[PDB]
C-alpha cells in the first residue's frame, strides 16, 4: 500500500511475522537494508546509519496457545520502517 | 524513551493526541519538522523530502462516548516517525 521502503535513503525490507495464535496473525516487520544511508550520489554512506522505528502495539493472543475459551490482550514492539540518523546534530 | 526524532536527517516533533474515550488515551503522533531532509552539511535539502511513516494499530473505544456498558475495538492509522525519500532510486 506504500513504497517508501524502496524510496527512502534508509531503505527497508518487510519480513512476515506469522503467528496463528495472535490477531493480527501476520505482521510485516521492517528490517533495514544497510547499516548506512544512501547519499546524494546513490552510494551507501557510513557517516550515518539506517535505524528501525519501533512502535508498541496491542495484539490479542489465544493464551494458552490453540485453546478456545481463553484470550489475552497484550502490548508488543514492532519495527515499522527505518530512518537515517547522524552523529552530528544541526 | 527514544531520541531518533532529534538525530534523524528527517527529524520530527511529537504531538499528543489526547482522547479519554479511547485506550490508549494519549498517542504521540510524529509530525515532520521540515519538507526536506538535513544534508551532510546540516542544511535542509529540498532534493529530498521528510515523510511520516504510518502504522495501522488496534485501539479500544468507549463507543458511544462516556457510556459504561459498551465498547468497540477498531483499527486506526498513526504517524510513528519520519523517513527521508528521494525522487532518484538507486
Amino acid at each position: 500500500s506504500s513504497d517508501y521502503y524502496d524510496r527512502s535513503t534508509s531503505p527497508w525490507n518487510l519480513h512476515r511475522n506469522e503467528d496463528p495464535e495472535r490477531y493480527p496473525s501476520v505482521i510485516w516487520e521492517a528490517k533495514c537494508r544497510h547499516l548506512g544511508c544512501i547519499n546524494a550520489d546513490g552510494n551507501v554512506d557510513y557517516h550515518m546509519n539506517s535505524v528501525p522505528i519501533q512502535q508498541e502495539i496491542l495484539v490479542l493472543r489465544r493464551e494458552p496457545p490453540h485453546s478456545p475459551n481463553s484470550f489475552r490482550l497484550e502490548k508488543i514492539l514492532v519495527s515499522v520502517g527505518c530512518t537515517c540518523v547522524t552523529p552530528i546534530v544541526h | 524513551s527514544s531520541d531518533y526524532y532529534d538525530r534523524s536527517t528527517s527529524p520530527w516533533n511529537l504531538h499528543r493526541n489526547e482522547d479519554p474515550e479511547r485506550y490508549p488515551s494519549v498517542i504521540w503522533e510524529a509530525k515532520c519538522r521540515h519538507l526536506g531532509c538535513i544534508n551532510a552539511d546540516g542544511n535542509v535539502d529540498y532534493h529530498m523530502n521528510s515523510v511520516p511513516i504510518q502504522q495501522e494499530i488496534l485501539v479500544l473505544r468507549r463507543e458511544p462516548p462516556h457510556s459504561p456498558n459498551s465498547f468497540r475495538l477498531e483499527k486506526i492509522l498513526v504517524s510513528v516517525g519520519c523517513t527521508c525519500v528521494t525522487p532518484i532510486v538507486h
Partner: antibody, heavy 121, light 111 residues
C-alpha cells in the same frame, strides 16, 4: 551535557582457560534504546582493542575476528543494561573491558569505568 | 577488517604544536568518521575529537582534527601545548562491520 551519560560495568574476575564469564553494563542519563553500544578492552600495558558492537534494537551484532563464535553481545533495553557473555576464555582475553556509547556504529562518544577480566590457570 | 598506524612517541616543549598521524590500510579513510581519545595513567579514555573534527563540550580549541585522503590519514594537532596534555592518544575508525583503534601515541612534553 558533560557528565550526564553514566556507564557502570560489573562482572570481571578470575576464570580458567576455557571458562565462561558475563559482563554487565548499567547505563543512565540518556535514551539507551536509541544508541549503538560497544565493548572495548585493554590488556595490561597495551593498546585499546575493539571487541564487539550491537545496534540500538539489538537486531544487529558485530565482533572482532579474535572473539567471533566465543563471545555474544546482547542488551536489555527495558533494564538499560548492556551484556557480554564470554565463552571458551583464553589467556589473550586478559584485559580491562570497557562499555561504550556510540553515536552511530563506530563513533564511540562515552566510556565506562572498566572491569578487569583475568584468564589464568 | 583493516588497521590504523600512528607513531609510538611524539615530543615537544610547552606552547609549541604537536601533530599525531593515523594512517589507514584497507578502505578509504574519508568514507568513515575518525575519533581521537586521550588516556591518562590508570584512567578510562576520554574523547578529544569525534567525527573527524568535532569537539565535545569541554575540550579546548588547542585540540583539532583533520583528515587527508591523498595519504589515507587522519591527524590530531595540539597547539599551545601544556604539561596536562602528556598522555596516550588513540585514533579510532570503522568499516561496515569492524571498529579499529590505532596502536596509540605516547605524548612527552619536553622541558
Amino acid at each position: 551535557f558533560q557528565g550526564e551519560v553514566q556507564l557502570l560495568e560489573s562482572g570481571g574476575g578470575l576464570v580458567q582457560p576455557g571458562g565462561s564469564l558475563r559482563l554487565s553494563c548499567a547505563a543512565s542519563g540518556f535514551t539507551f534504546s536509541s544508541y549503538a553500544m560497544s565493548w572495548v578492552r585493554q590488556a595490561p600495558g597495551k593498546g585499546l582493542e575493539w571487541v564487539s558492537a550491537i545496534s540500538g534494537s539489538g537486531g544487529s551484532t558485530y565482533y572482532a575476528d579474535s572473539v567471533k563464535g566465543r563471545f555474544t553481545i546482547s542488551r536489555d533495553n527495558s533494564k538499560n543494561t548492556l551484556y557480554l557473555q564470554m565463552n571458551s576464555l583464553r589467556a589473550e582475553d586478559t584485559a580491562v573491558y570497557y562499555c561504550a556509547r556510540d553515536l552511530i556504529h563506530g563513533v564511540t562518544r562515552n566510556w565506562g569505568q572498566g572491569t578487569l577480566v583475568t584468564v589464568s590457570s | 577488517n583493516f588497521m590504523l598506524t600512528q607513531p609510538h612517541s611524539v615530543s615537544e616543549s610547552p606552547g609549541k604544536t604537536v601533530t599525531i598521524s593515523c594512517t589507514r590500510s584497507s578502505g578509504s579513510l574519508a568514507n568513515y568518521y575518525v575519533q581521537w581519545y586521550q588516556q591518562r595513567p590508570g584512567s578510562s579514555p576520554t574523547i578529544v575529537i569525534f567525527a573527524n573534527n568535532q569537539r565535545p563540550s569541554g575540550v579546548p580549541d588547542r585540540f583539532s582534527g583533520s583528515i587527508d585522503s591523498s595519504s589515507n590519514s587522519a591527524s590530531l594537532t595540539i597547539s599551545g601545548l601544556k604539561t596536562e596534555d602528556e598522555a596516550d592518544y588513540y585514533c579510532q575508525t570503522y568499516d561496515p562491520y569492524s571498529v579499529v583503534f590505532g596502536g596509540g601515541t605516547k605524548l612527552t612534553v619536553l622541558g
